[PDB]
Each structure stands twice: as structure tokens, then as C-alpha cells.
Amino acid sequence: HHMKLDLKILDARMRDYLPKYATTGSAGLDLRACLDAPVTLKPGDTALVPTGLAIHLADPGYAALILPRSGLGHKHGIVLGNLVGLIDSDYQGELMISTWNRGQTEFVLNPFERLAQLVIVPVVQATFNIVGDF
Amino acid sequence: HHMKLDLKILDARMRDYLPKYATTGSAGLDLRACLDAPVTLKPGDTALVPTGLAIHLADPGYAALILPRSGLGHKHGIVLGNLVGLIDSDYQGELMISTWNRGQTEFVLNPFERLAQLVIVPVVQATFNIVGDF
Amino acid sequence: HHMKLDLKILDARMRDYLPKYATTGSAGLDLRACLDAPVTLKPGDTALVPTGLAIHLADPGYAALILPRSGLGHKHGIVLGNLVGLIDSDYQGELMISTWNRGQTEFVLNPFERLAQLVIVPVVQATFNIVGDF
């Protein structure tokens, strides 16, 4: 499916770096580091990296998952400190990336570097029914 | 969407700590540690933490993902040892959280502390079709 | 739901080891290591492990998530170096598993060992709408 997704550009430099689907078959949008200067990430360290963007999914039938990038993660050990992020339909603040160096090699994160992937999935809100036995 | 979700309270202390959606726009349910006493997690260690709860999704068109919490993960390095848990529609045992300290700071997990997020997503069962070329 | 999923067997040894849903209620398919010989993974190391298989989801309304296995991850610290893999509907290359030993114990990965889980989920492609305020 498609969905109209409201996007606020919090940092004007990101007008030139908006997330884009690579192909019509792509599942994810790439989120980039909105940084004034490169950030060095030592092995084991975590940085909170702004994206310069906010979204409003709005429809409670959907959420977004934020995932590491395959190359950064596999090749450089640059992943997410919370592993996978969950963006609620009513979350309207800046998207921030918990960036964790899970490997053994110091890495320099560049301004505007693609850092994570955003995937929009349907979700269900359960209504619990307490039972003694299933 | 909404779904009727059968829930068994395996440990009576959890009647006062049932998972709840924070808002009508929330995607996830918070799962809590069902513990008699605090558990200290040294850097690198993994503990299997009970929730005191079991669910039965029942509908094979759905599954649950269990994710780290953003604050615990980012700020304290308390995440999941299997990274992301997948709960099958027919899994009816106690939900257990593989809790891993991925950081460098010893952490004390409290009884009833929110430890993970549960998100219900639709899933598809594929029927493979072996081909020589796509 | 169900979906016809084209599958190319890139390595003939995998004809005897095709992924299979354990039960009609299972959400995930197990992906196995297609290896000539066991691979030793020291703590902290990452290996790129072939599956001997390629899929073509084809429908841009779906994607696959590749997750660690719960037992391997929890008990042995054998997880994914990119944490969670995202397979796009138009990705038709060999499925490769970034295999990372996140724990403190050396592990030997066996030929044909189940290494990851593949889950097919619906996804949405957003059309951004830039707004000044939500």
C-alpha cells in the first residue's frame, strides 16, 4: 500500500537530503545523520544522532520500525543502541537514532550519512481477555 | 485494527501490572519483569526474565515482535539477548525475556520494571515455488 | 494470509534443507547455514554466511524481516551483525546472514545449522507531505 505521511523538516539542511525509496520495490526509507560535524564513535559507545526530521503517522493501524543498515551493521558494526526502534502513530517529535558501535573498530560518522532504515508496518492493538486456560 | 487476545496470568502478582497501551496511538505493550527480587546484570551478561504472563494470539495471520525499550536500550544498554523476539500465533507458554547488558555499566533490574515492548503485526505464510530463474 | 513465493536454490545441497514452517501457526521460516565446513566464531567476530537460497517476494506490499533465533541468541550469543535484516520485494540475490557472536564464548557454526528466522510482513510505502506543523 501507500500512505500520505506528514513530514516536518526541523533542520533546513535536510531539504536536500529527504528520505527516498530507492526503487518502487523498496521496503525502507533511509534516515541520515543531521550533524554539524563528523562524530567519532569508539568501540562500545552510543551517540544520540538527530535526523532533522519528524513524522506523524497518525493512523493507529500503522507504526514504523527503525532498523540498522545492512552494510554499516555488518561491515562496520554501526547499529542501533536500542536494536530496533518503534515509532508510534502519535509520536510527533524529532526522529533520533541511538547509534551504537557494537564492533572493535573506531568509526567516524559523517554529516548526512545514511544511518538507519525506516519501515512502515500495520499493527494491531489487542484487547486482552483474561482466561484461566487457553 | 483491534484483536481479542487471550491472556493467562501465570503469576498472581501481575494482576496489578498488566500490559497497557499508553495512548490510543501506541503501537506497543510494555512487558515487565516478574521477579521476587532485583537482579544485577553485569556488562555482557544475559538473564532469562519471566513476565508472569502467557498470550495466545491464535490467528495464524498475526505474530508478535518483542523489542527492547528505547530508554533502557539507549541509556542503559539493557536490551534483548536474541535482539528481537518472535512470538508465533500458537505459542502459549510464558513470555520470557532474554535480557542482555550490551553496555559497560552494571545495572540492577527491578521487580516489575518495564523491560521490553510487544508489537502485534500481520504475517504471511509463504508457499514456496522453486524456479530456475525469477 | 498465504503467498506464492518464488525460491531459487543456488546451492544444490539445500534441496534437502529447504526452509519449512514448523506448524500451521508458525510465523517464521528457518534459514540454515550453507557451508562446506564448520566455521568458528570467536567472541566479537562477524561472518557472512550464505544460505544457498534466493527469494523473490515480488509484491511491493510485502517485505521480509530476518531475525536471530531465540535459542542461539539467548544461549550462545549468536545473532545478526546488522541485528535485523530487511529483504525488499525486489531483492533477488542470495540471502546472506551477517552472523555475529555478541557473547563471550567461542562457537562453532555447523553446516546446515539453523541460523536465523525469516518473517514476511506487509509494508507501506509512504508519500511524504511536507508540513510546517502537524
Swiss-Prot record, chains A, B, C:
Belongs to the dUTPase family. It comes from Burkholderia thailandensis (strain ATCC 700388 / DSM 13276 / CCUG 48851 / CIP 106301 / E264). The keyword Magnesium applies. The keyword ATP-binding does not apply. This enzyme is involved in nucleotide metabolism: it produces dUMP, the immediate precursor of thymidine nucleotides and it decreases the intracellular concentration of dUTP so that uracil cannot be incorporated into DNA. Its cofactor is Mg(2+). Substrate binds at R69, S70, G71, N82, L86, I87, D88, M96. It catalyses: dUTP + H2O = dUMP + diphosphate + H(+). This is Deoxyuridine 5'-triphosphate nucleotidohydrolase. Keywords: Hydrolase, Magnesium, Metal-binding, Nucleotide metabolism. It is an enzyme of class 3 (hydrolase). InterPro entries: dUTPase (IPR008181), dUTPase-like (IPR029054), dUTPase-like_sf (IPR036157), dUTPase_trimeric (IPR033704). Its EC number is 3.6.1.23. Pathway: Pyrimidine metabolism; dUMP biosynthesis; dUMP from dCTP (dUTP route): step 2/2. One of its GO terms (biological process) is dUTP catabolic process. One of its GO terms (molecular function) is magnesium ion binding.
